[PDB]
PDB file of N, CA and C in Angstrom:
ATOM      1  N   UNK A   1      22.389 -24.627 -27.209  1.00  0.00           N
ATOM      2  CA  UNK A   1      23.518 -24.471 -28.120  1.00  0.00           C
ATOM      3  C   UNK A   1      23.575 -23.008 -28.603  1.00  0.00           C
ATOM      4  N   UNK A   2      24.735 -22.603 -29.099  1.00  0.00           N
ATOM      5  CA  UNK A   2      24.966 -21.222 -29.527  1.00  0.00           C
ATOM      6  C   UNK A   2      23.947 -20.905 -30.592  1.00  0.00           C
ATOM      7  N   UNK A   3      23.319 -19.757 -30.443  1.00  0.00           N
ATOM      8  CA  UNK A   3      22.267 -19.318 -31.351  1.00  0.00           C
ATOM      9  C   UNK A   3      22.938 -18.670 -32.537  1.00  0.00           C
ATOM     10  N   UNK A   4      22.650 -19.168 -33.719  1.00  0.00           N
ATOM     11  CA  UNK A   4      23.257 -18.622 -34.914  1.00  0.00           C
ATOM     12  C   UNK A   4      22.181 -18.167 -35.883  1.00  0.00           C
ATOM     13  N   UNK A   5      22.297 -16.925 -36.338  1.00  0.00           N
ATOM     14  CA  UNK A   5      21.381 -16.402 -37.331  1.00  0.00           C
ATOM     15  C   UNK A   5      22.169 -16.023 -38.569  1.00  0.00           C
ATOM     16  N   UNK A   6      21.747 -16.528 -39.718  1.00  0.00           N
ATOM     17  CA  UNK A   6      22.419 -16.232 -40.969  1.00  0.00           C
ATOM     18  C   UNK A   6      21.445 -15.509 -41.874  1.00  0.00           C
ATOM     19  N   UNK A   7      21.868 -14.363 -42.392  1.00  0.00           N
ATOM     20  CA  UNK A   7      21.119 -13.636 -43.390  1.00  0.00           C
ATOM     21  C   UNK A   7      21.313 -14.316 -44.696  1.00  0.00           C
ATOM     22  N   UNK A   8      20.240 -14.835 -45.260  1.00  0.00           N
ATOM     23  CA  UNK A   8      20.280 -15.410 -46.602  1.00  0.00           C
ATOM     24  C   UNK A   8      20.823 -14.451 -47.668  1.00  0.00           C
ATOM     25  N   UNK A   9      20.413 -13.184 -47.666  1.00  0.00           N
ATOM     26  CA  UNK A   9      20.934 -12.214 -48.639  1.00  0.00           C
ATOM     27  C   UNK A   9      22.446 -12.012 -48.583  1.00  0.00           C
ATOM     28  N   UNK A  10      22.985 -11.729 -47.410  1.00  0.00           N
ATOM     29  CA  UNK A  10      24.421 -11.511 -47.234  1.00  0.00           C
ATOM     30  C   UNK A  10      25.355 -12.678 -47.590  1.00  0.00           C
ATOM     31  N   UNK A  11      24.983 -13.869 -47.147  1.00  0.00           N
ATOM     32  CA  UNK A  11      25.744 -15.075 -47.421  1.00  0.00           C
ATOM     33  C   UNK A  11      25.716 -15.505 -48.870  1.00  0.00           C
ATOM     34  N   UNK A  12      24.552 -15.448 -49.539  1.00  0.00           N
ATOM     35  CA  UNK A  12      24.434 -15.936 -50.921  1.00  0.00           C
ATOM     36  C   UNK A  12      24.795 -14.945 -52.029  1.00  0.00           C
ATOM     37  N   UNK A  13      23.927 -13.972 -52.268  1.00  0.00           N
ATOM     38  CA  UNK A  13      24.091 -12.951 -53.305  1.00  0.00           C
ATOM     39  C   UNK A  13      25.356 -12.128 -53.043  1.00  0.00           C
ATOM     40  N   UNK A  14      25.566 -11.832 -51.785  1.00  0.00           N
ATOM     41  CA  UNK A  14      26.712 -11.003 -51.345  1.00  0.00           C
ATOM     42  C   UNK A  14      26.338  -9.541 -51.477  1.00  0.00           C
ATOM     43  N   UNK A  15      27.347  -8.679 -51.495  1.00  0.00           N
ATOM     44  CA  UNK A  15      27.140  -7.222 -51.471  1.00  0.00           C
ATOM     45  C   UNK A  15      26.514  -6.751 -52.782  1.00  0.00           C
ATOM     46  N   UNK A  16      26.863  -7.459 -53.856  1.00  0.00           N
ATOM     47  CA  UNK A  16      26.431  -7.139 -55.210  1.00  0.00           C
ATOM     48  C   UNK A  16      24.913  -7.051 -55.414  1.00  0.00           C
ATOM     49  N   UNK A  17      24.494  -5.984 -56.087  1.00  0.00           N
ATOM     50  CA  UNK A  17      23.091  -5.763 -56.435  1.00  0.00           C
ATOM     51  C   UNK A  17      22.520  -6.808 -57.396  1.00  0.00           C
ATOM     52  N   UNK A  18      23.316  -7.240 -58.367  1.00  0.00           N
ATOM     53  CA  UNK A  18      22.865  -8.202 -59.370  1.00  0.00           C
ATOM     54  C   UNK A  18      22.465  -9.524 -58.721  1.00  0.00           C
ATOM     55  N   UNK A  19      23.205  -9.923 -57.675  1.00  0.00           N
ATOM     56  CA  UNK A  19      22.976 -11.163 -57.009  1.00  0.00           C
ATOM     57  C   UNK A  19      21.617 -11.067 -56.274  1.00  0.00           C
ATOM     58  N   UNK A  20      21.328  -9.896 -55.736  1.00  0.00           N
ATOM     59  CA  UNK A  20      20.036  -9.635 -55.031  1.00  0.00           C
ATOM     60  C   UNK A  20      18.788  -9.818 -55.906  1.00  0.00           C
ATOM     61  N   UNK A  21      18.873  -9.376 -57.142  1.00  0.00           N
ATOM     62  CA  UNK A  21      17.766  -9.504 -58.097  1.00  0.00           C
ATOM     63  C   UNK A  21      17.575 -10.936 -58.513  1.00  0.00           C
ATOM     64  N   UNK A  22      18.667 -11.640 -58.768  1.00  0.00           N
ATOM     65  CA  UNK A  22      18.592 -13.064 -59.109  1.00  0.00           C
ATOM     66  C   UNK A  22      18.049 -13.885 -57.937  1.00  0.00           C
ATOM     67  N   UNK A  23      18.422 -13.498 -56.719  1.00  0.00           N
ATOM     68  CA  UNK A  23      17.952 -14.182 -55.522  1.00  0.00           C
ATOM     69  C   UNK A  23      16.424 -14.043 -55.359  1.00  0.00           C
ATOM     70  N   UNK A  24      15.927 -12.864 -55.713  1.00  0.00           N
ATOM     71  CA  UNK A  24      14.514 -12.526 -55.597  1.00  0.00           C
ATOM     72  C   UNK A  24      13.645 -13.459 -56.431  1.00  0.00           C
ATOM     73  N   UNK A  25      14.145 -13.846 -57.599  1.00  0.00           N
ATOM     74  CA  UNK A  25      13.447 -14.798 -58.474  1.00  0.00           C
ATOM     75  C   UNK A  25      13.146 -16.125 -57.785  1.00  0.00           C
ATOM     76  N   UNK A  26      14.092 -16.626 -56.990  1.00  0.00           N
ATOM     77  CA  UNK A  26      13.880 -17.888 -56.306  1.00  0.00           C
ATOM     78  C   UNK A  26      12.685 -17.919 -55.378  1.00  0.00           C
ATOM     79  N   UNK A  27      12.408 -16.839 -54.640  1.00  0.00           N
ATOM     80  CA  UNK A  27      11.200 -16.774 -53.807  1.00  0.00           C
ATOM     81  C   UNK A  27      11.493 -16.493 -52.357  1.00  0.00           C
ATOM     82  N   UNK A  28      10.787 -17.204 -51.480  1.00  0.00           N
ATOM     83  CA  UNK A  28      10.848 -16.966 -50.058  1.00  0.00           C
ATOM     84  C   UNK A  28      11.830 -17.915 -49.370  1.00  0.00           C
ATOM     85  N   UNK A  29      12.654 -18.595 -50.166  1.00  0.00           N
ATOM     86  CA  UNK A  29      13.709 -19.447 -49.636  1.00  0.00           C
ATOM     87  C   UNK A  29      14.676 -18.701 -48.754  1.00  0.00           C
ATOM     88  N   UNK A  30      15.054 -17.495 -49.154  1.00  0.00           N
ATOM     89  CA  UNK A  30      15.945 -16.690 -48.345  1.00  0.00           C
ATOM     90  C   UNK A  30      15.249 -16.363 -47.017  1.00  0.00           C
ATOM     91  N   UNK A  31      13.972 -15.988 -47.095  1.00  0.00           N
ATOM     92  CA  UNK A  31      13.194 -15.623 -45.919  1.00  0.00           C
ATOM     93  C   UNK A  31      12.885 -16.830 -45.026  1.00  0.00           C
ATOM     94  N   UNK A  32      12.528 -17.941 -45.656  1.00  0.00           N
ATOM     95  CA  UNK A  32      12.099 -19.131 -44.915  1.00  0.00           C
ATOM     96  C   UNK A  32      13.237 -19.654 -44.034  1.00  0.00           C
ATOM     97  N   UNK A  33      14.460 -19.571 -44.562  1.00  0.00           N
ATOM     98  CA  UNK A  33      15.628 -19.997 -43.802  1.00  0.00           C
ATOM     99  C   UNK A  33      15.826 -19.175 -42.550  1.00  0.00           C
ATOM    100  N   UNK A  34      15.573 -17.875 -42.639  1.00  0.00           N
ATOM    101  CA  UNK A  34      15.715 -16.999 -41.488  1.00  0.00           C
ATOM    102  C   UNK A  34      14.731 -17.370 -40.397  1.00  0.00           C
ATOM    103  N   UNK A  35      13.499 -17.686 -40.800  1.00  0.00           N
ATOM    104  CA  UNK A  35      12.471 -18.064 -39.849  1.00  0.00           C
ATOM    105  C   UNK A  35      12.864 -19.316 -39.081  1.00  0.00           C
ATOM    106  N   UNK A  36      13.405 -20.293 -39.790  1.00  0.00           N
ATOM    107  CA  UNK A  36      13.786 -21.532 -39.139  1.00  0.00           C
ATOM    108  C   UNK A  36      14.892 -21.308 -38.094  1.00  0.00           C
ATOM    109  N   UNK A  37      15.879 -20.499 -38.456  1.00  0.00           N
ATOM    110  CA  UNK A  37      17.021 -20.214 -37.618  1.00  0.00           C
ATOM    111  C   UNK A  37      16.724 -19.401 -36.384  1.00  0.00           C
ATOM    112  N   UNK A  38      15.906 -18.358 -36.504  1.00  0.00           N
ATOM    113  CA  UNK A  38      15.589 -17.542 -35.341  1.00  0.00           C
ATOM    114  C   UNK A  38      14.876 -18.420 -34.299  1.00  0.00           C
ATOM    115  N   UNK A  39      13.914 -19.194 -34.825  1.00  0.00           N
ATOM    116  CA  UNK A  39      13.113 -20.140 -34.061  1.00  0.00           C
ATOM    117  C   UNK A  39      14.019 -21.087 -33.305  1.00  0.00           C
ATOM    118  N   UNK A  40      15.089 -21.561 -33.948  1.00  0.00           N
ATOM    119  CA  UNK A  40      16.075 -22.381 -33.221  1.00  0.00           C
ATOM    120  C   UNK A  40      16.759 -21.511 -32.174  1.00  0.00           C
ATOM    121  N   UNK A  41      17.082 -20.271 -32.524  1.00  0.00           N
ATOM    122  CA  UNK A  41      17.737 -19.365 -31.580  1.00  0.00           C
ATOM    123  C   UNK A  41      16.794 -19.018 -30.427  1.00  0.00           C
ATOM    124  N   UNK A  42      15.513 -18.820 -30.735  1.00  0.00           N
ATOM    125  CA  UNK A  42      14.508 -18.503 -29.720  1.00  0.00           C
ATOM    126  C   UNK A  42      14.337 -19.697 -28.775  1.00  0.00           C
ATOM    127  N   UNK A  43      14.350 -20.895 -29.360  1.00  0.00           N
ATOM    128  CA  UNK A  43      14.180 -22.133 -28.609  1.00  0.00           C
ATOM    129  C   UNK A  43      15.244 -22.336 -27.530  1.00  0.00           C
ATOM    130  N   UNK A  44      16.467 -21.930 -27.813  1.00  0.00           N
ATOM    131  CA  UNK A  44      17.577 -22.092 -26.914  1.00  0.00           C
ATOM    132  C   UNK A  44      17.408 -21.251 -25.675  1.00  0.00           C
ATOM    133  N   UNK A  45      16.860 -20.040 -25.788  1.00  0.00           N
ATOM    134  CA  UNK A  45      16.512 -19.268 -24.612  1.00  0.00           C
ATOM    135  C   UNK A  45      15.472 -19.957 -23.731  1.00  0.00           C
ATOM    136  N   UNK A  46      14.459 -20.553 -24.353  1.00  0.00           N
ATOM    137  CA  UNK A  46      13.342 -21.195 -23.636  1.00  0.00           C
ATOM    138  C   UNK A  46      13.863 -22.399 -22.834  1.00  0.00           C
ATOM    139  N   UNK A  47      14.781 -23.136 -23.447  1.00  0.00           N
ATOM    140  CA  UNK A  47      15.368 -24.297 -22.781  1.00  0.00           C
ATOM    141  C   UNK A  47      16.067 -23.938 -21.480  1.00  0.00           C
ATOM    142  N   UNK A  48      16.876 -22.879 -21.475  1.00  0.00           N
ATOM    143  CA  UNK A  48      17.591 -22.494 -20.271  1.00  0.00           C
ATOM    144  C   UNK A  48      16.584 -22.076 -19.214  1.00  0.00           C
ATOM    145  N   UNK A  49      15.561 -21.329 -19.635  1.00  0.00           N
ATOM    146  CA  UNK A  49      14.562 -20.875 -18.717  1.00  0.00           C
ATOM    147  C   UNK A  49      13.842 -22.048 -18.079  1.00  0.00           C
TER     148      UNK A  49
ATOM    149  N   UNK B   1       0.151   0.836 -45.611  1.00  0.00           N
ATOM    150  CA  UNK B   1       1.301   1.197 -44.789  1.00  0.00           C
ATOM    151  C   UNK B   1       2.553   1.237 -45.651  1.00  0.00           C
ATOM    152  N   UNK B   2       3.390   2.250 -45.459  1.00  0.00           N
ATOM    153  CA  UNK B   2       4.630   2.383 -46.214  1.00  0.00           C
ATOM    154  C   UNK B   2       5.795   1.788 -45.461  1.00  0.00           C
ATOM    155  N   UNK B   3       6.387   0.740 -46.029  1.00  0.00           N
ATOM    156  CA  UNK B   3       7.474   0.043 -45.368  1.00  0.00           C
ATOM    157  C   UNK B   3       8.723   0.858 -45.157  1.00  0.00           C
ATOM    158  N   UNK B   4       9.124   1.629 -46.159  1.00  0.00           N
ATOM    159  CA  UNK B   4      10.344   2.422 -46.041  1.00  0.00           C
ATOM    160  C   UNK B   4      10.069   3.782 -45.412  1.00  0.00           C
ATOM    161  N   UNK B   5       9.826   3.793 -44.107  1.00  0.00           N
ATOM    162  CA  UNK B   5       9.575   5.027 -43.407  1.00  0.00           C
ATOM    163  C   UNK B   5       9.932   4.881 -41.944  1.00  0.00           C
ATOM    164  N   UNK B   6       8.921   4.752 -41.100  1.00  0.00           N
ATOM    165  CA  UNK B   6       9.119   4.597 -39.683  1.00  0.00           C
ATOM    166  C   UNK B   6       9.638   3.198 -39.364  1.00  0.00           C
ATOM    167  N   UNK B   7      10.327   3.046 -38.225  1.00  0.00           N
ATOM    168  CA  UNK B   7      10.786   1.734 -37.797  1.00  0.00           C
ATOM    169  C   UNK B   7       9.611   0.804 -37.547  1.00  0.00           C
ATOM    170  N   UNK B   8       8.545   1.332 -36.941  1.00  0.00           N
ATOM    171  CA  UNK B   8       7.334   0.572 -36.684  1.00  0.00           C
ATOM    172  C   UNK B   8       6.714   0.080 -37.978  1.00  0.00           C
ATOM    173  N   UNK B   9       6.704   0.954 -38.971  1.00  0.00           N
ATOM    174  CA  UNK B   9       6.122   0.650 -40.268  1.00  0.00           C
ATOM    175  C   UNK B   9       6.836  -0.519 -40.936  1.00  0.00           C
ATOM    176  N   UNK B  10       8.160  -0.566 -40.798  1.00  0.00           N
ATOM    177  CA  UNK B  10       8.956  -1.638 -41.388  1.00  0.00           C
ATOM    178  C   UNK B  10       8.597  -2.992 -40.803  1.00  0.00           C
ATOM    179  N   UNK B  11       8.288  -3.007 -39.511  1.00  0.00           N
ATOM    180  CA  UNK B  11       7.936  -4.222 -38.800  1.00  0.00           C
ATOM    181  C   UNK B  11       6.688  -4.870 -39.364  1.00  0.00           C
ATOM    182  N   UNK B  12       5.713  -4.051 -39.712  1.00  0.00           N
ATOM    183  CA  UNK B  12       4.469  -4.567 -40.255  1.00  0.00           C
ATOM    184  C   UNK B  12       4.710  -5.306 -41.551  1.00  0.00           C
ATOM    185  N   UNK B  13       5.594  -4.776 -42.384  1.00  0.00           N
ATOM    186  CA  UNK B  13       5.861  -5.374 -43.698  1.00  0.00           C
ATOM    187  C   UNK B  13       6.502  -6.776 -43.574  1.00  0.00           C
ATOM    188  N   UNK B  14       7.485  -6.929 -42.701  1.00  0.00           N
ATOM    189  CA  UNK B  14       8.118  -8.231 -42.536  1.00  0.00           C
ATOM    190  C   UNK B  14       7.120  -9.216 -41.947  1.00  0.00           C
ATOM    191  N   UNK B  15       6.363  -8.731 -40.965  1.00  0.00           N
ATOM    192  CA  UNK B  15       5.326  -9.497 -40.306  1.00  0.00           C
ATOM    193  C   UNK B  15       4.162  -9.828 -41.232  1.00  0.00           C
ATOM    194  N   UNK B  16       3.897  -8.907 -42.169  1.00  0.00           N
ATOM    195  CA  UNK B  16       2.838  -8.955 -43.184  1.00  0.00           C
ATOM    196  C   UNK B  16       1.429  -8.849 -42.607  1.00  0.00           C
ATOM    197  N   UNK B  17       1.305  -8.168 -41.475  1.00  0.00           N
ATOM    198  CA  UNK B  17       0.017  -7.944 -40.837  1.00  0.00           C
ATOM    199  C   UNK B  17      -0.087  -6.498 -40.372  1.00  0.00           C
ATOM    200  N   UNK B  18      -1.293  -5.946 -40.412  1.00  0.00           N
ATOM    201  CA  UNK B  18      -1.503  -4.565 -39.982  1.00  0.00           C
ATOM    202  C   UNK B  18      -1.279  -4.359 -38.494  1.00  0.00           C
ATOM    203  N   UNK B  19      -1.676  -5.331 -37.684  1.00  0.00           N
ATOM    204  CA  UNK B  19      -1.488  -5.227 -36.248  1.00  0.00           C
ATOM    205  C   UNK B  19      -0.367  -6.142 -35.779  1.00  0.00           C
ATOM    206  N   UNK B  20       0.542  -5.614 -34.978  1.00  0.00           N
ATOM    207  CA  UNK B  20       1.677  -6.383 -34.486  1.00  0.00           C
ATOM    208  C   UNK B  20       1.651  -6.549 -32.977  1.00  0.00           C
ATOM    209  N   UNK B  21       1.804  -7.791 -32.542  1.00  0.00           N
ATOM    210  CA  UNK B  21       1.759  -8.134 -31.116  1.00  0.00           C
ATOM    211  C   UNK B  21       3.049  -7.721 -30.452  1.00  0.00           C
ATOM    212  N   UNK B  22       3.017  -7.530 -29.141  1.00  0.00           N
ATOM    213  CA  UNK B  22       4.211  -7.113 -28.420  1.00  0.00           C
ATOM    214  C   UNK B  22       5.300  -8.165 -28.553  1.00  0.00           C
ATOM    215  N   UNK B  23       6.525  -7.704 -28.765  1.00  0.00           N
ATOM    216  CA  UNK B  23       7.660  -8.602 -28.874  1.00  0.00           C
ATOM    217  C   UNK B  23       8.851  -7.950 -29.536  1.00  0.00           C
ATOM    218  N   UNK B  24       9.825  -8.764 -29.900  1.00  0.00           N
ATOM    219  CA  UNK B  24      11.005  -8.294 -30.600  1.00  0.00           C
ATOM    220  C   UNK B  24      10.995  -8.966 -31.959  1.00  0.00           C
ATOM    221  N   UNK B  25      11.064  -8.178 -33.014  1.00  0.00           N
ATOM    222  CA  UNK B  25      11.056  -8.709 -34.377  1.00  0.00           C
ATOM    223  C   UNK B  25      12.234  -8.154 -35.138  1.00  0.00           C
ATOM    224  N   UNK B  26      12.802  -8.940 -36.042  1.00  0.00           N
ATOM    225  CA  UNK B  26      13.914  -8.452 -36.847  1.00  0.00           C
ATOM    226  C   UNK B  26      13.370  -8.140 -38.221  1.00  0.00           C
ATOM    227  N   UNK B  27      13.548  -6.908 -38.660  1.00  0.00           N
ATOM    228  CA  UNK B  27      12.977  -6.481 -39.934  1.00  0.00           C
ATOM    229  C   UNK B  27      13.950  -6.449 -41.105  1.00  0.00           C
ATOM    230  N   UNK B  28      15.083  -5.778 -40.945  1.00  0.00           N
ATOM    231  CA  UNK B  28      16.024  -5.663 -42.051  1.00  0.00           C
ATOM    232  C   UNK B  28      17.475  -5.562 -41.620  1.00  0.00           C
ATOM    233  N   UNK B  29      18.364  -5.994 -42.500  1.00  0.00           N
ATOM    234  CA  UNK B  29      19.787  -5.932 -42.230  1.00  0.00           C
ATOM    235  C   UNK B  29      20.263  -4.503 -42.381  1.00  0.00           C
ATOM    236  N   UNK B  30      21.277  -4.134 -41.612  1.00  0.00           N
ATOM    237  CA  UNK B  30      21.860  -2.810 -41.712  1.00  0.00           C
ATOM    238  C   UNK B  30      23.308  -2.931 -42.149  1.00  0.00           C
ATOM    239  N   UNK B  31      23.648  -2.272 -43.243  1.00  0.00           N
ATOM    240  CA  UNK B  31      25.013  -2.286 -43.762  1.00  0.00           C
ATOM    241  C   UNK B  31      25.433  -0.860 -44.093  1.00  0.00           C
ATOM    242  N   UNK B  32      26.726  -0.594 -44.005  1.00  0.00           N
ATOM    243  CA  UNK B  32      27.236   0.720 -44.335  1.00  0.00           C
ATOM    244  C   UNK B  32      27.750   0.735 -45.765  1.00  0.00           C
ATOM    245  N   UNK B  33      27.200   1.638 -46.565  1.00  0.00           N
ATOM    246  CA  UNK B  33      27.604   1.772 -47.952  1.00  0.00           C
ATOM    247  C   UNK B  33      29.017   2.300 -48.046  1.00  0.00           C
ATOM    248  N   UNK B  34      29.793   1.831 -49.033  1.00  0.00           N
ATOM    249  CA  UNK B  34      31.139   2.373 -49.138  1.00  0.00           C
ATOM    250  C   UNK B  34      31.070   3.811 -49.614  1.00  0.00           C
ATOM    251  N   UNK B  35      31.731   4.697 -48.896  1.00  0.00           N
ATOM    252  CA  UNK B  35      31.727   6.121 -49.218  1.00  0.00           C
ATOM    253  C   UNK B  35      32.469   6.462 -50.514  1.00  0.00           C
ATOM    254  N   UNK B  36      33.634   5.854 -50.717  1.00  0.00           N
ATOM    255  CA  UNK B  36      34.448   6.132 -51.901  1.00  0.00           C
ATOM    256  C   UNK B  36      35.131   4.891 -52.456  1.00  0.00           C
ATOM    257  N   UNK B  37      35.523   4.972 -53.723  1.00  0.00           N
ATOM    258  CA  UNK B  37      36.227   3.883 -54.381  1.00  0.00           C
ATOM    259  C   UNK B  37      37.669   4.292 -54.647  1.00  0.00           C
ATOM    260  N   UNK B  38      38.608   3.481 -54.202  1.00  0.00           N
ATOM    261  CA  UNK B  38      40.032   3.763 -54.366  1.00  0.00           C
ATOM    262  C   UNK B  38      40.665   2.664 -55.197  1.00  0.00           C
ATOM    263  N   UNK B  39      41.381   3.050 -56.242  1.00  0.00           N
ATOM    264  CA  UNK B  39      42.028   2.109 -57.161  1.00  0.00           C
ATOM    265  C   UNK B  39      43.529   2.280 -57.103  1.00  0.00           C
ATOM    266  N   UNK B  40      44.255   1.181 -56.999  1.00  0.00           N
ATOM    267  CA  UNK B  40      45.715   1.244 -56.892  1.00  0.00           C
ATOM    268  C   UNK B  40      46.416   0.305 -57.860  1.00  0.00           C
ATOM    269  N   UNK B  41      46.314   0.609 -59.149  1.00  0.00           N
ATOM    270  CA  UNK B  41      46.967  -0.196 -60.179  1.00  0.00           C
ATOM    271  C   UNK B  41      48.446   0.113 -60.284  1.00  0.00           C
ATOM    272  N   UNK B  42      49.214  -0.782 -60.917  1.00  0.00           N
ATOM    273  CA  UNK B  42      50.653  -0.546 -61.027  1.00  0.00           C
ATOM    274  C   UNK B  42      50.964   0.731 -61.777  1.00  0.00           C
ATOM    275  N   UNK B  43      51.998   1.424 -61.322  1.00  0.00           N
ATOM    276  CA  UNK B  43      52.387   2.713 -61.890  1.00  0.00           C
ATOM    277  C   UNK B  43      53.321   2.586 -63.089  1.00  0.00           C
ATOM    278  N   UNK B  44      53.562   1.377 -63.550  1.00  0.00           N
ATOM    279  CA  UNK B  44      54.467   1.177 -64.665  1.00  0.00           C
ATOM    280  C   UNK B  44      53.988   1.945 -65.896  1.00  0.00           C
ATOM    281  N   UNK B  45      54.891   2.756 -66.446  1.00  0.00           N
ATOM    282  CA  UNK B  45      54.639   3.643 -67.604  1.00  0.00           C
ATOM    283  C   UNK B  45      54.491   3.048 -69.021  1.00  0.00           C
ATOM    284  N   UNK B  46      55.305   2.077 -69.380  1.00  0.00           N
ATOM    285  CA  UNK B  46      55.347   1.568 -70.762  1.00  0.00           C
ATOM    286  C   UNK B  46      54.039   0.959 -71.273  1.00  0.00           C
ATOM    287  N   UNK B  47      53.749   1.225 -72.542  1.00  0.00           N
ATOM    288  CA  UNK B  47      52.561   0.705 -73.163  1.00  0.00           C
ATOM    289  C   UNK B  47      52.915  -0.634 -73.778  1.00  0.00           C
ATOM    290  N   UNK B  48      52.232  -1.684 -73.345  1.00  0.00           N
ATOM    291  CA  UNK B  48      52.477  -3.002 -73.853  1.00  0.00           C
ATOM    292  C   UNK B  48      52.202  -2.996 -75.323  1.00  0.00           C
TER     293      UNK B  48
END
């Protein structure tokens, strides 16, 4: 399936600096989501191979 | 290691390890800062 990667920072907080600081308080949720998605994207290459 | 320097250096920080194995890693988003701010409010003269 089409590999989709979403930046947690860009989608949630947006361009605004204030949103970035508030996002930081939450933790590694922004980061953890990226890991899951790339892995799905990486997996799709392996399947075709 | 200083993250905000070399491209290689940035990779270590996201990875969080001093030694990095061969591969492709994504470290940070790249965005272009707005160069200038332009405002276009109505030109109507009268003071409310």
